[PDB]
Design a protein around this motif. Structure first.
Motif, PDB file in Angstrom:
ATOM      1  N   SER A 177       1.069   6.894  -6.274  1.00 36.26           N
ATOM      2  CA  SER A 177       0.026   7.909  -6.230  1.00 36.26           C
ATOM      3  C   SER A 177       0.632   9.295  -6.413  1.00 36.26           C
ATOM      4  CB  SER A 177      -0.713   7.840  -4.892  1.00 36.26           C
ATOM      5  OG  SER A 177      -1.974   8.483  -5.019  1.00 36.26           O
ATOM      6  N   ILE A 219       0.826  -1.179   0.000  1.00 33.67           N
ATOM      7  CA  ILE A 219       0.000   0.000   0.000  1.00 33.67           C
ATOM      8  C   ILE A 219       0.877   1.252   0.000  1.00 33.67           C
ATOM      9  CG2 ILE A 219      -1.605   1.277   1.397  1.00 33.67           C
ATOM     10  CD1 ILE A 219      -2.614  -1.435   2.370  1.00 33.67           C
ATOM     11  N   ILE A 220       1.951   1.204   0.782  1.00 34.82           N
ATOM     12  CA  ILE A 220       2.897   2.296   0.875  1.00 34.82           C
ATOM     13  C   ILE A 220       3.589   2.497  -0.464  1.00 34.82           C
ATOM     14  CG2 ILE A 220       5.239   2.620   1.694  1.00 34.82           C
ATOM     15  CD1 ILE A 220       4.045   1.492   4.393  1.00 34.82           C
ATOM     16  N   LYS A 265       2.031   1.843  -3.237  1.00 31.06           N
ATOM     17  CA  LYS A 265       0.995   2.399  -4.087  1.00 31.06           C
ATOM     18  C   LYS A 265       0.879   3.879  -3.782  1.00 31.06           C
ATOM     19  CE  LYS A 265       0.445  -1.593  -5.682  1.00 31.06           C
ATOM     20  NZ  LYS A 265       1.078  -0.984  -6.886  1.00 31.06           N
ATOM     21  N   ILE A 266       1.105   4.219  -2.521  1.00 28.33           N
ATOM     22  CA  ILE A 266       1.078   5.589  -2.102  1.00 28.33           C
ATOM     23  C   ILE A 266       2.159   6.338  -2.847  1.00 28.33           C
ATOM     24  CG2 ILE A 266       1.772   6.999  -0.197  1.00 28.33           C
ATOM     25  CD1 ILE A 266       0.422   4.945   1.587  1.00 28.33           C
TER      26      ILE A 266
END
Length: 13
Positions: A12, A5-6, A8-9
């Motif tokens: 982002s 997720i990090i 993906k962050i």
């Protein structure tokens, strides 16, 4: 199933 997720962050910004 967390850092991903990090990562993906990162995709982002």
């Amino acid at each position: 199933g967390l850092f991903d997720i990090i990562k993906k962050i990162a995709e982002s910004f």
